[PDB]
Amino acid sequence: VQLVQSGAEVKKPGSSVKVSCKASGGTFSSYAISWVRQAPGQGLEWMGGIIPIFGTANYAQKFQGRVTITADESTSTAYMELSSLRSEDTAVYYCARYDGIYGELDFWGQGTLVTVSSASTKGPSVFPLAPGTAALGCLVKDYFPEPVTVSWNSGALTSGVHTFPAVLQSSGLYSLSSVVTVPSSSLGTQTYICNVNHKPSNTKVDKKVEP
């Protein structure tokens, strides 16, 4: 069982967002799907849930009039739509599986960051941070909205990696660094490549970091 959600995106205030949640295996069977949101630095808040076999959806009072939860059994996909978006709706939106008669949430989607802003989408520029221990990294600069993801050597390099929280610059654009410490003796033999993804702009960059 795996729940795969649609990508992060910016939405203008007053607009509506639709987030999808695709269940692998080929069905959500007799089970149900909840939507749960998490504002930056905040706790978890249940938005509502749908039980496809009963054809019913329940919403939290706070979202009644703005939220719509639907599910297409034939494509094993659930949807959450949220209208009249405001700044306070900026959050990671999660789908999660439960059993209608119980309600613990055993499988979760990866989350979808929806940013409510008037600012336009912008892809990042990726710059090297050039190097018995050496540090190297990539600076991922001038993008909007969040998030970017970073791996090293296609996920083969994980030890000693630190990818930092982004900062919002005075320009209104984000900037993030990702670093790794390695043996200095590895600099002549191994290639260090940061793999940077920014879904909102469909940007993928592999940047080699040379000594």
């Binding site: 978890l44 329940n58 439960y98 119980y102 309600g103 710059f127 930092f164 929280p165 900062v167």
Partner: protein, 219 residues
Amino acid sequence: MDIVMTQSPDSLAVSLGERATINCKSSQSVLYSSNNKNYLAWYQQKPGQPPKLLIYWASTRESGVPDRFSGSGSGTDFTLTISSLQAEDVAVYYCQQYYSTPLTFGQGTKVEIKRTVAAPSVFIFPPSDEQLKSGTASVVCLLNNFYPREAKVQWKVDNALQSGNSQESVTEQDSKDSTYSLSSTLTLSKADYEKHKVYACEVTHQGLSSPVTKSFNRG
């Protein structure tokens, strides 16, 4: 008549291998008469990740969850115990009731490790030639794997103390060695960058005997 979930404490920090205790109180009983089960779950959440189910029915361990995690309680009073806190256990923990809709969560309890002081290793990075094409220069200073979180970075350009032109962020606690890392960026126009020679990052941390300076000369 929404069921309110209240956790205590909001934050805890104990040494590696010490017991960690997180309490959760529900505003109404979540014990169902007809099956004598408590409709209560516990979750672990790490940064960048969704919550992960640890415990359901108040005391049943989810498959794959280590024995050091145990849920207890009935009615309105519940507790998640980590018998011997491991480095990888640092996270935010949430309780949840599913006795009735709306499903509701506790506010979360942050769990961290207390460990010995560790001084950062410090690295400075000049702006790349490719970035300079843009007319902007970012100079980066890295403080790698220090404890505790408290640290100070001071930027100097030709020995002149910088103010208002830097930003920093800090990682969550490391899941292996329980340290923190910090990245600071100094932003200048290319013009300003090209006018000066010595770029220095001065780091103060209680693990160091005195402030450590890493520097480079442009060109």
